[PDB]
Structure 1
Amino acid sequence: EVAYATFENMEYGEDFMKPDTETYNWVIQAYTRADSYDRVQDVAELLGMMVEDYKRVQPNVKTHALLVECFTKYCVVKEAIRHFRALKNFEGGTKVLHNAGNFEDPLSLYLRALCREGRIVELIDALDAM
């Protein structure tokens, strides 16, 4: 809520204060790594706001890595697969998702979730990116 208050200051402010791609990444990251309570609805609404701002804001490698991490944690696997496909086209890619093994290693969780659900064809494509 601390980061989201700053985001609202920017989203409903003047033109020079409008959020950029980095601004969305910080607010998304705040909800993905929240200590308590379910935050998947907050992330999905922020994603919708970012998509509505497409004429001015476009994603980068961090945006997809955070979204893969969030949807994997809440076991929204089919959405994590969509954003992992977009993450493949960015150089570096899976290393950003790995986060050097921090935050419960989001790269491994994505692989584990694919194995647990029998999405093997997606699992092999994930290894190709790695």
Structure 2
Amino acid sequence: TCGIPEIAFATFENMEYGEDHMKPDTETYNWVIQAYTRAESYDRVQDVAELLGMMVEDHKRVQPNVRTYALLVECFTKYCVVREAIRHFRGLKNFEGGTQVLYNDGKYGDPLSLYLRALCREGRIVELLEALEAMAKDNQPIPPRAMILSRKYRTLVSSWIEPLQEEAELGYEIDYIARYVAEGGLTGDRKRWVPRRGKTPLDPDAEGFIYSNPRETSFKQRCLEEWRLHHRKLLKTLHNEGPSILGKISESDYIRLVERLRKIIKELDELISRIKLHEGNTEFWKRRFLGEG
């Protein structure tokens, strides 16, 4: 809780490279991850990854708990790394009451709100649906960070739609004076969307994020991006490790397949269907390393 992660990393080094009775445990890794996550000095995003690499010690009973997954989700969301945030949020969901621990009473940036907004901005709404239906099961209300844009239509149900930064037709004309009176004005202070010189987050949704909010993309863009990336890794696998296949019509099949796949990224469909990509299976790579595969 000091703010300098080095004073905690020194203790962690004293514990890790010491005797057996002073070896660290899950709580020690959690404290050091918290010290490196909630700092206010520099990047500290590679240190957390190195520490999580050190935390891969199966035989030392170093297993993660709810707080470990919560801190990892928070750290990877605050640095705009969502493809690991969702991976760790799944494990946090496997435990009971993980969403309550992730929402640490709204004390530090409301990590649950930041995670929901990160899922909303990038348009990965299938993940958001899981993240939403995992909340009412644990009886967790929505945090007050339901930030609306200057155009009063921005919510978790608006970004993924095709029109972006566009008001929706609601029949009667927009009551600009009524919106001005309701949001503020005539008393106190109003959030004035005026650029300034100081390096302060202008948009109110970039309050918790370290650098800035992730790039705003609708669901169609994300779907086409994941489709083209799937086809790109398929062609990359078939290029080097896919010279031979079960079909013996390669002379006329490969010439068509290469051009089809290169034109898709920028009825002969089953030939690509049975193409099986071996990714994430450690047994396959172990067999290939042993010399069998």
Into which bin does the TM-score normalised by the smaller protein fall? Answer: over 0.9
Structure-1 residue corresponding to 2:45: 40
Deviation at 1:129, TM superposition (A): 1.3
Identity of aligned residues (%): 84
| Residue 12, structure 1, aligned to residue 17, structure 2 | yes
Runs of 5+ consecutive residues of structure 2 not aligned to the other structure = 1-5, 136-293
Deviation at 1:35, TM superposition (A): 1.1
Deviation at 1:61, TM superposition (A): 0.2
Deviation at 1:102, TM superposition (A): 1.1
TM-score (norm 2): 0.44
Structure-2 residue corresponding to 1:129: 134
Structure-2 residue corresponding to 1:50: 55
Q: Aligned with 2:109: secondary structure? A: coil
Q: Partners in 1 of 2:12 and 2:45 — Cα distance?
A: 17
Deviation at 1:91, TM superposition (A): 0.9
Q: Partners in 1 of 2:77 and 2:41 — Cα distance?
A: 17
What is the aligned counterpart of 2:83 among 78, 86, 91?
78
TM-score (norm 1): 0.98
Superposed CA offset, 1:75-96 (max 9, x none): 1110101100000011111110
- Structure of greater Rg: 2
Q: Partners in 2 of 1:50 and 1:84 — Cα distance?
A: 18
Structure-1 residue corresponding to 2:174: none
User: What is the aligned-residue RMSD (CA, Å)?
Assistant: 0.6
Greater than 3 Å deviation, 4+ residue runs? none
Deviation at 1:14, TM superposition (A): 0.2
Q: Partners in 1 of 2:74 and 2:87 — Cα distance?
A: 12
Superposed CA offset, 1:90-130 (max 9, x none): 11111100001111000000000000000000001001111
Deviation at 1:55, TM superposition (A): 1.5
Q: Partners in 1 of 2:128 and 2:107 — Cα distance?
A: 21
Q: Aligned with 1:101: secondary structure? A: coil
